[PDB]
Amino acid sequence: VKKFPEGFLWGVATASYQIEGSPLADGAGMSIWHTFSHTPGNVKNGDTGDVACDHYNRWKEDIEIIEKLGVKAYRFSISWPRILPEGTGRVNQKGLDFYNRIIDTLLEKGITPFVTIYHWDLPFALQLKGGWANREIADWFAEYSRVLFENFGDRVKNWITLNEPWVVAIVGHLYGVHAPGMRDIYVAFRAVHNLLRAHARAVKVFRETVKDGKIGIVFNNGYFEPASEKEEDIRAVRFMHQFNNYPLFLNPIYRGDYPELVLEFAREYLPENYKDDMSEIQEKIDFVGLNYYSGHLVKFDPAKVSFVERDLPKTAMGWEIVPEGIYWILKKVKEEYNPPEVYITENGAAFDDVVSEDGRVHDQNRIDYLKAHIGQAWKAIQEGVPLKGYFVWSLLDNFEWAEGYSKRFGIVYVDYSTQKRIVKDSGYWYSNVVKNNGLE
Ligand SMILES: OC[C@@H]1[C@@H](O)[C@H](O)[C@@H](O)c2[nH]cc[n+]21
């Protein structure tokens, strides 16, 4: 028996562009994921978010699935361009109505809404004006956030400004693998910095608008272990943590500067007077959300870092399964920054799910993955990490960004030819976990 604290939030998580479809319904503006995925060569099999899980029409059934499973919290995101089609100025009432109906239904059913304000679908109109590269995004984001607060802050009390700003900046603007598909290191670090200033401006508006809520920010994290005992391999791991994990953003937020190994690699790429923005960036936040999935063996390599293949079980993504990582990153966040609250805002796995003659989905692979990680998060709670909740990625199989529909992360199976949902063995298993408030 590994029982969790009283009132611990068991959740599932999604994102707007990944599940909704109908990206241009009811007056919505185009997002950068619409235009990116409609550009040939950008996404596996030419997949797009045009239909996805059709959650835009099937939202009530999906929520009834959450209810039926006894899951207590739902993390979902809001499509910025459904709300403000040109990014700023005009507010689309039908976009608001979409999420209002979802919010009210959740509350009526006793499910707690966790709203991610930004999960990667920037209005195309703002990308034309530079997107995250443009300092003015701090204002655009603040105005968008304000609209959300004033419309939903009466019911939604748990808010996340940004999902994984490292991904948004680096993967979108350095690697060119995600929208807007750019490859410029100077742009990428100007996006890092602007994402911090936009987050902080949104927290500032939140304090003025929603006197009773809590607001945080979510980061992607990996468990980096060194390839050897050498100083250089250990330092490589020190860099990877500071750059890829929560320190890139939490050091500015809590300590007022970037981490030192980030400045050694990247100072030339940041704005010259970037320090002028640091005091505003230190705006107080209520919680840290950490996403965690995999570990990496790492060595210095004359980036100056490469990864080392390890045997280890991998998921269908080719990601090594390292459950002790989730315990480590939870310990390390307390040790380094001691935020008053942490949530695991995403944890999950992609496996090659098949519907058996059954037709059940016997994803014992995913049960083992989840169980293992839930166990390590228990451990962290026993050693005093203020972990208040845990969210499975994902409720549904969905559009997995540049992988398209070929990667299935759901605890609910989606048959794309019909839109039939089939609860996986992992979903039933997780329901039992929530009911008992822990493992057995
Ligand atoms: O790759 C599975 C998922 C994506 O679908 C989510 O949008 C994203 O927030 C995330 N971070 C780490 C892994 N994932």
UniProtKB/Swiss-Prot annotation:
Keyword Hydrolase belongs to the record: yes
Enzyme class: hydrolase
Key word Secreted present: no
Record keywords, A-Z: Carbohydrate metabolism, Cellulose degradation, Glycosidase, Hydrolase, Polysaccharide degradation
Pathway(s) this gene product operates in, as recorded in its UniProt entry: Glycan metabolism; cellulose degradation
Taxonomy, superkingdom: Bacteria
This enzyme's EC code(s): 3.2.1.21
Catalytic reaction equation(s): Hydrolysis of terminal, non-reducing beta-D-glucosyl residues with release of beta-D-glucose
Location of the active site: E164, E346
GO molecular function, one term: beta-glucosidase activity
One Pfam family here: Glyco_hydro_1
Any single GO BP term: cellulose catabolic process
Parts of the chain that traverse the membrane: none
NCBIfam families linked: BGL
Family: Belongs to the glycosyl hydrolase 1 family.
Protein name: Beta-glucosidase A
Organism (species): Thermotoga maritima (strain ATCC 43589 / DSM 3109 / JCM 10099 / NBRC 100826 / MSB8)
Lineage: Bacteria, Thermotogati, Thermotogota, Thermotogae, Thermotogales
Gene: bglA
